UniProtKB/Swiss-Prot annotation, chain A:
Native species: Severe acute respiratory syndrome coronavirus 2 (2019-nCoV)
Function summary: Attaches the virion to the cell membrane by interacting with host receptor, initiating the infection. The major receptor is host ACE2. When S2/S2' has been cleaved, binding to the receptor triggers direct fusion at the cell membrane. When S2/S2' has not been cleaved, binding to the receptor results in internalization of the virus by endocytosis using host TFRC and GRM2 and leading to fusion of the virion membrane with the host endosomal membrane. Alternatively, may use NRP1/NRP2 and integrin as entry receptors.
Subunit text: Binds to host ACE2. RBD also interacts with the N-linked glycan on 'Asn-90' of ACE2. Cleavage of S generates a polybasic C-terminal sequence on S1 that binds to host Neuropilin-1 (NRP1) and Neuropilin-2 (NRP2) receptors. Interacts with host integrin alpha-5/beta-1 (ITGA5:ITGB1) and with ACE2 in complex with integrin alpha-5/beta-1 (ITGA5:ITGB1). May interact via cytoplasmic c-terminus with M protein. May interact (via N-terminus) with host bilirubin and biliverdin, thereby preventing antibody binding to the SARS-CoV-2 spike NTD via an allosteric mechanism.
Gene giving rise to this polypeptide: S
Protein name: Spike protein S1
Full-sequence range covered: 386 to 434 of 1273
Result of changing residue 32 to N: In strain: Beta/B.1.351, Omicron/BA.1, Omicron/BA.2, Omicron/BA.2.12.1, Omicron/BA.2.75, Omicron/BA.4, Omicron/BA.5, Omicron/BQ.1.1, Omicron/XBB.1.5, Omicron/EG.5.1; May enhance affinity to human ACE2 receptor
């Protein structure tokens, strides 16, 4: 349903992490890198690929 | 059963599910009490009159 909806202020995040830590980069999750390098907000409304 | 106790033990992110509910349940207590008071007040008003 992405196309039908319309949005402002879109941002793009770039980085490479190992497969094991892919779960960590998500809202309300804990990882060394997630809690020490890049932490997603609780109210995030975005899609990560 | 304690807001201080529940809050210390739980983080906000997954906190909400328990924090949200206690709030819903407590709201119920107030509404029953508030509604009850009005009926009681109405009875007293008739008696007063």
């Amino acid at each position: 349903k992405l196309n039908d909806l319309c949005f402002t202020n879109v941002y793009a995040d770039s980085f490479v992490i190992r497969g094991d830590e892919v779960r960590q980069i998500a809202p309300g999750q804990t990882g060394k890198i997630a809690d020490y390098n890049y932490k997603l907000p609780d109210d995030f409304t975005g899609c990560v690929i | 059963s304690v807001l201080n106790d529940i809050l210390s033990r739980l983080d906000p992110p997954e906190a909400e599910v328990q924090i949200d509910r206690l709030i819903t349940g407590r709201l119920q207590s107030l509404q029953t009490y508030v509604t009850q008071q009005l009926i009681r007040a109405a009875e007293i008003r008739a008696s007063a009159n």
